[PDB]
């Protein structure tokens, strides 16, 4: 850190005051630059502060007109420590009218706090920033109402991209600079330019790797150009970032002790620290300025001006850090749903007494008041209007006040007030009444009996299901009888059921009348319920719940049972889906389907059957030469099947079943049937040998040719082609009926001369090969 340390600044109106940061290297406080209305971009263009590397508290920018980016104002800012926050935020950019991009392209760590960038109407380059590499808790950020959320910011990124919430997008600060991502090994202590890890005692950037004296921002504590995990014995920790010698702390104490014009701290020494005040239970010495244990009880009383303090952020809580007795009243009014329980415990944990009252109003995020770890006594010397010492007006998420099993909290004066606390169960309030000792007086507004706990399960007692019965669509339930101390207070039971695909479960409310009363409780009849319309072999989540009158005299709390997962009984499955069969070969077929739409239980196997089918009878009787006429298998874990060893061009029938169980009385689906014809073979319909002929004196020629032995299904007709010597060619159709009638084909009226004839066969699939040429002669008259 080659520069002076500055005590933290506020800069308003004029940019002339911006020059006091000229030599600064660390700001020991907050940096606020705000309310510069007459500024223009021509003024900020030549203004740079490269020496600033660290801000201890926070950085706030508010209505600085004419500022377009911070890439020039703070070129080398590295770490914002965040010891003190601005409404639990360590960087606020609010209402910056002319800002375009942030540009803090060297910012590496914000050690404590969140970031709030809001109402910047021309600001882009926000979605291109991976905040998870800067803030450890990004869920508490607030980046809204900017140009990003309005139009389509043109983030023309120049830069290791990164995945956020399941989306892979690039990272960059400006159009010429982008985020400096470091290897995961170099975790939280930065990396070199080439990726080598720096020393574990360094923070952010570093010059050379693994060197404790060559890093810019320094983790833990800094001393004489070196980082130390803890300061050496001669030095003491100061401001949680640097080690100072005794002369420094003593000089600060002496400077503060001479005057009280505005207010400072009598800096004091403790166990290797230079703290503003001696902690609780210690007193300041005379000369060496060292906290020593007291001779008796020494609480750290924190006197609140105006008589009351409202806690709405981490800053307000930090204003009470270390105090043991609050001489005033506390209002807890935390909004926003940020769950500040950790910081509240850290800062308000040591509070032991509250002289006035305590009020928890509109604390939406608050879950429980356990962060008051040591609150022992609300004295109530100043009461809220209505003589209340404890107040709870609207707590959406308050589900607990204290753990009364091991916590003790008494109230000297005043009543209690509880209203509109949807998740605060009345049993907790009544336990608070018993513990706090308010018995002896009365609380007029003790509890709004119906506005407290009506969104939370306040049942405490346990109830057991007597037995459970299952069926394929119906389920019957019975459970033990519940009996409140007052019989008339019972109002029945409520049963809920919902589909439960998981084991870690919308619900359908079922109202049940109270069980029938009997003179002998041993003769009392067990209430029960039955259900209809349940999917077979399907799991559901069930439970029961009682209901009693909220009689404040007896304050009965009813009862509840457990949650159980019950599966229905399996039944027959539905038809197999998409049953198709394709003959992949002349002798092979493939059957394909999909599992049934309703398995109705675990699917075990499939039943497949196939067999041969005879050809149609009409094919053996119809004439086509006229115009205008022409063994089983069980399949397991598979949705396809192949069958081989078949006949070509033969009608077949295939039957497919779906069975959800094999051994215990087989349960299969409805029968699906498909019929198909296999592919034919070319050689099946081919003719063999020539045509035998006979010649008669009346110019009639008889032709006889061999019928194919194994045709593709059936031979339907034959084609006879004959041509005279030196003449054209003629064709003739011979049907199967004609072929059987004439035992071939007879040609009549042929002209005299020599003829050559060839004959081809036709089957159901196609035409066969031609016959060998045959020569015959016709007599001339």
């Amino acid at each position: 850190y080659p520069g002076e340390v500055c005590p933290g600044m506020d800069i308003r109106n004029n940019l002339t005051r911006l020059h006091e940061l000229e030599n600064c290297s660390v700001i020991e406080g907050h940096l606020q630059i705000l309310l510069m209305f007459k500024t223009r971009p021509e003024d900020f263009r030549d203004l740079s502060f490269p020496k600033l590397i660290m801000i201890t508290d926070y950085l706030l920018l508010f209505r600085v007109y004419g500022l377009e980016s911070l890439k020039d104002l703070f070129p080398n800012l590295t770490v914002i420590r965040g010891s003190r926050l601005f409404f639990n935020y360590a960087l606020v950019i609010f209402e910056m009218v002319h800002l375009k991009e942030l540009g803090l392209y060297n910012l590496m760590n914000i050690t404590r706090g969140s970031v709030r960038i809001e109402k910047n109407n021309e600001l882009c380059y926000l979605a291109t920033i991976d905040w998870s590499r800067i803030l450890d808790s990004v869920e508490d950020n607030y980046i809204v109402l900017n140009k990003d959320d309005n139009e389509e910011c043109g983030d023309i990124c120049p830069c290791p991209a990164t995945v956020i919430n399941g989306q892979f997008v690039e990272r960059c600060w400006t159009h010429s600079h982008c985020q400096k991502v470091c290897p995961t090994i170099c975790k939280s202590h930065g990396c070199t330019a080439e990726g080598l890890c720096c020393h574990s005692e360094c923070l952010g950037n570093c010059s050379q790797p693994d060197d404790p004296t060559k890093c810019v921002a320094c983790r833990n504590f800094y001393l004489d150009g070196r980082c130390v995990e803890t300061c050496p014995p001669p030095y003491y920790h100061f401001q949680d970032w640097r080690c100072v010698n005794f002369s420094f702390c003593q000089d600060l104490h002496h400077k503060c002790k001479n005057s009280r014009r505005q207010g400072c701290h009598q800096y004091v020494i403790h166990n290797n620290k230079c703290i503003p005040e001696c902690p609780s239970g210690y007193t300041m010495n005379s000369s060496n300025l060292l906290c020593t244990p007291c001779l008796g009880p020494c609480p750290k009383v924190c006197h609140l001006l105006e008589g009351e303090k409202t806690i709405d952020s981490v800053t307000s809580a930090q204003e009470l850090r270390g105090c043991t007795v609050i001489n005033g009243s506390l209002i807890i009014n935390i909004r926003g749903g940020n769950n500040l329980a950790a910081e509240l415990e850290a800062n308000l944990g040591l509070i032991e007494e509250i002289s006035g009252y305590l009020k928890i109003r509109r604390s939406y995020a608050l879950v429980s008041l356990s962060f008051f770890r040591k609150l022992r006594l609300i004295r109530g010397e100043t009461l809220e209007i209505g003589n209340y010492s404890f107040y709870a007006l609207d707590n959406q998420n308050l589900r607990q006040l204290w753990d009364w099993s091991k916590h003790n909290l008494t109230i000297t004066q005043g009543k209690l007030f509880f209203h509109y606390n949807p998740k605060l169960c009345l049993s907790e309030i009544h336990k608070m009444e018993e513990v706090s000792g308010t018995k002896g007086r009365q609380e007029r507004n003790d509890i709004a009996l119906k506005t407290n706990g009506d969104q939370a399960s306040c049942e405490n007692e346990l109830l057991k299901f007597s037995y459970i019965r299952t069926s394929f669509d119906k389920i019957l339930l019975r459970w033990e009888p519940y009996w409140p101390p007052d019989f008339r207070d019972l109002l029945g039971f409520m049963l809920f059921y919902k589909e439960a695909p998981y084991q870690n479960v919308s619900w359908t409310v079922v109202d049940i009348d109270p069980p029938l009363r009997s003179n002998d409780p041993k003769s009392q009849n067990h209430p029960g319920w039955l259900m209809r319309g349940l999917k077979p072999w399907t799991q559901y989540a069930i439970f029961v719940k009682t209901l009693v009158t909220f009689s404040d005299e007896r304050r009965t709390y009813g009862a509840k049972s457990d949650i159980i997962y019950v599966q229905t009984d399996a039944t027959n499955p539905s038809v197999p889906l998409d049953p198709i069969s394709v003959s992949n070969s002349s002798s092979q077929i493939i059957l394909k389907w999909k599992p049934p739409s309703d398995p109705n239980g675990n699917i075990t196997h499939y039943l497949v059957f196939w067999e041969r089918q005879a050809e149609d009878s009409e094919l053996f009787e119809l004439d086509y030469c006229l115009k205008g006429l022409k063994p089983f298998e069980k399949v397991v874990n598979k949705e396809s099947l192949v069958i081989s060893g078949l006949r070509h061009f033969t009608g077949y029938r295939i039957e497919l079943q779906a069975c959800n169980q094999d051994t215990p009385e087989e349960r299969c689906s409805v029968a699906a049937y498909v019929s198909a014809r296999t592919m034919p073979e070319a050689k099946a319909d081919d003719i063999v040998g020539p045509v035998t002929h006979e010649i008669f004196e009346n110019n009639v020629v008889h032709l006889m040719w061999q019928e194919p032995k194994e045709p593709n299904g059936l031979i339907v007709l034959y084609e006879v082609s004959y041509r005279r010597y030196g003449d054209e060619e003629l064709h003739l159709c011979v049907s199967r009926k004609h072929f059987a009638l004439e035992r071939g084909c007879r040609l009549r009226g042929l002209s005299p001369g020599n003829y050559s004839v060839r004959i081809r066969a036709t089957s159901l699939a196609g035409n066969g090969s031609w016959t060998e040429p045959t020569y015959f002669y016709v007599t001339d008259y």
């Binding site: 019965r469 069926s471 119906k474 019957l476 039955l530």
Partner: peptide
């Protein structure tokens, strides 16, 4: 209600 009566019995 045949199954309902069976459940009853």
């Amino acid at each position: 209600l045949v199954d309902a009566l069976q459940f009853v019995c």
